[PDB]
């Protein structure tokens, strides 16, 4: 009951896939937090480096994501996975080494020449971080989509359970890793942090390599695969155009459309929301409690998605999730026109034309945070159902290109969001931004609604079977 069953469970493809994904996410999040903190620190606190980093990441993701989706769709599986892993890990190690070495020779190198090498070093850091992010995106899409779909086989409940477990692991890692890495940073020296990051990434490289080989050996169905200067610049353009037009012509175009539209928002736990809360003076312990509540509601959303998909269906699950999120956003919107809200149209939203950076009632904030948390539960359910739809309804010979164009679209809608944060950074004009975000959410769900009407007709409200 314990000696044999546990040993059998710990030697299955599912568990090894879970372990590999958890290690990869842990390493990625730790690296991301370390890079953010270090770039905030060694360079003076300013929006220039942050804006450059965000813009570079977004644009690279769009273009090279279409390209790498095409590349993944035309090679073997073990080769692509191993390649992605090695590239990402080596990028991270080298980047961290260079970072620490500059942290060392900072003043001497600044005095050297006319300071023209600091810019080169920043360029190198940005480029290598971008390369690592691209490799991480590639490995994420290939592993999750292709390998999860193949391993799950023919059962549909297994696919749902696998997706839910992946989401839970992602949420727990996202909550936990930054806290631990910040603790180890503040309890020591930057040498401790950088050495820890590099060593952890190296060991993770080795272990994940072995785990991927073992999973490939265990499942024999992964080996088979159905379907198997002017020109050097023209070929990428042809692949880009073909991928985008193929994505546009898919019958599930509107679902991915709505999911992408759901990405531009300020109603999420993020640097902007935390800054607004600090402006309102909500301390740090309360912020930690709110993050814990957010994680709990995300887990609850995954559980609800599993139950609903088992009970009602796939499309109706998306409808229910959309309705829930919309109601919670309405609750959040109510907060703006309430006492204690610093909003007025008299002050122009645009104040930094060319400069930039280069008591009170408490009901409003409480209502806002309740709204965002319940929105989080609904959004997680909707994300899971759309992901399963995309996994289930795409030809194998094109699972890479379609998912890559999806990622590009998602990042685009992210980029626009960042832009508006630059345009209206005033704490007063925050409320208006909220409205815009809610509006966008509505549009997405409306668009998803049309998809439902194209696949269910007038029988839009019947969860059970006919009687």
């Amino acid at each position, epitope marked *: 009951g314990c000696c044999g069953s546990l040993a059998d469970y710990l030697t299955s493809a599912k568990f090894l896939l879970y372990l590999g994904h958890s290690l990869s996410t842990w390493g990625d999040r730790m690296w991301h937090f370390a890079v953010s903190v270090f770039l905030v620190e060694l360079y003076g606190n300013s929006l220039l480096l942050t804006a450059v980093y965000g813009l570079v990441v977004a644009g690279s993701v769009l273009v090279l994501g279409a390209i790498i989706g095409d590349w993944v769709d035309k090679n073997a599986r073990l080769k692509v996975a191993q390649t992605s892993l090695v590239v990402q890990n080596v990028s991270v190690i080298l980047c961290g080494i260079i970072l620490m070495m500059v942290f060392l020779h900072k003043h001497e190198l600044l005095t050297m020449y006319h300071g023209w090498v600091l810019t080169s070093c920043y360029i190198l850091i940005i480029t290598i971080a971008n390369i690592a992010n691209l490799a991480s995106t590639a490995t994420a899409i290939t592993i999750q989509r292709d390998w999860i779909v193949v391993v799950a086989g023919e059962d549909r409940s297994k696919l749902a359970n696998m997706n839910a477990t992946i989401r839970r692991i992602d949420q727990l890692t996202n909550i936990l890793a930054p806290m631990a890495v910040g603790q180890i940073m503040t309890f020591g020296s930057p040498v401790i942090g950088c050495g820890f990051i590099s060593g952890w990434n190296l060991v993770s490289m080795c272990v994940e390599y072995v785990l991927l080989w073992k999973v490939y050996q265990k499942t024999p169905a992964l080996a088979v695969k159905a*379907g198997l200067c002017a020109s050097q610049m023209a070929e990428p353009f042809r692949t880009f155009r073909d991928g985008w037009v193929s994505y546009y012509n*898919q019958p599930v175009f509107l679902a991915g459309m709505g999911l992408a539209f759901l990405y531009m928002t300020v109603l999420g736990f993020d640097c902007i929301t935390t800054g607004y809360a600090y402006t309102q003076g909500l301390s740090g312990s309360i912020l930690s409690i709110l993050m814990g509540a957010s994680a709990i509601t995300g887990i609850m959303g995954t559980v609800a998605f599993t139950w609903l998909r088992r009970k009602c269906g796939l499309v109706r699950t998306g409808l229910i999730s959309g309705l829930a999120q919309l109601s919670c956003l309405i609750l959040c919107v109510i907060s703006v026109f309430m006492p204690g809200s610093p909003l007025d149209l008299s002050v122009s939203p645009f104040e930094d034309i060319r400069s930039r950076f280069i008591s009170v009632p408490i009901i409003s904030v409480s209502l806002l945070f309740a709204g965002v948390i319940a929105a989080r539960i609904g959004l997680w359910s909707f994300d899971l159902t759309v992901t399963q739809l995309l996994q289930e309804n795409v030809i194998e010979s094109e699972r890479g290109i379609i998912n890559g164009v999806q990622n590009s679209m998602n990042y685009l809608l992210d980029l626009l969001h960042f832009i508006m944060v630059i345009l209206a950074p005033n704490p007063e004009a925050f409320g208006l931004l909220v409205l815009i975000s809610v509006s966008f959410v509505a549009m997405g769900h409306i668009m998803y609604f049309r998809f439902a009407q194209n*696949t269910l007709g007038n029988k839009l409200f019947a969860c059970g079977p006919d009687a």
Partner: antibody, heavy 120, light 108 residues
Framework: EVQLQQSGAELVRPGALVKLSCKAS????????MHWVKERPEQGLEWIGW????????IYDPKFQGKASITADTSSNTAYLQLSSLTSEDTAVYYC?????????????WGQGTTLTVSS | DIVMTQSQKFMSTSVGDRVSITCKAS??????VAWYQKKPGQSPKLLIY???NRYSGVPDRFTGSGSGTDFTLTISNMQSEDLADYFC?????????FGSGTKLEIKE
């Protein structure tokens, strides 16, 4: 080896009830959608509807909305099509087909077909 | 709903040459078209899916082409084992619809 079996050679009087069966061997119908298709003599193929055996949801064609019913049995791995108020214009050949998803590209496996005739 | 029509009904061919069957839709379906073959007294069998891809054990003399509203199935070097009916079916949106079909007859 995937196989679909249908009972056939049905002759009925007008205004009655007919039940046709499609039995699957080599796979579980719980993982697929089951579709029914009609073919009338010297006419084209017509789609009737589909069922999901996992939960029992059924989608029909507005032309057959009020005269056809589809049911499934997971334990016996069988699908059933029921027709009511038959008229002489219903004599045809009926096929049971398998589909993968909501927008599956193709019907990989079909049935042998069942001949239904309405006489007097 | 989308009405899917094939112009030619009877196509009289000869052994050894190449033939083309055209299918036209009333809306911009995209690339969601499949071609099936049916012999008399039998059940239809899959030939081409997504207008370009072949299905496993199918002779390489069948080719799918087209996009938008017009699609074409081409047979190179016809063989006596290819005198049957061919249907084009769309799956862009519900309800699903089929084509009328096409006959093949030899020359005399």
């Amino acid at each position: 080896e995937v196989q679909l079996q249908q009972s056939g050679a049905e002759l009925v009087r007008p205004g009655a009830l007919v039940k046709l069966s499609c039995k699957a061997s080599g796979f579980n119908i719980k993982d697929y959608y089951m579709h029914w298709v009609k073919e009338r003599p010297e006419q084209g193929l017509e789609w009737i509807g589909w069922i999901d055996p996992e939960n029992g949801n059924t989608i029909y064609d507005p032309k057959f909305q009020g005269k056809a019913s589809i049911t499934a049995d997971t334990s016996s791995n069988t699908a059933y099509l029921q027709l009511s108020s038959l008229t002489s214009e219903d004599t045809a050949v009926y096929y049971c087909a398998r589909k993968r998803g909501y927008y599956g590209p193709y019907f990989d496996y079909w049935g042998q077909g069942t001949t239904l005739t309405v006489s007097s | 709903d989308i009405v899917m029509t094939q112009s030619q009904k009877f196509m009289s061919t000869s052994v050894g040459d190449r033939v083309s069957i055209t299918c036209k839709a009333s809306q911009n379906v995209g690339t969601a078209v499949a071609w099936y073959q049916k012999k008399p007294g039998q059940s239809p069998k899959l030939l081409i899916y997504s207008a370009s891809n072949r299905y496993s054990g199918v002779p390489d003399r069948f080719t799918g082409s087209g996009s938008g509203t017009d699609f074409t199935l081409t047979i190179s070097n016809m063989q006596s084992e290819d005198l049957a009916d061919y249907f084009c079916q769309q799956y862009g949106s519900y309800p699903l619809t089929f084509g009328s079909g096409t006959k093949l007859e030899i020359k005399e």
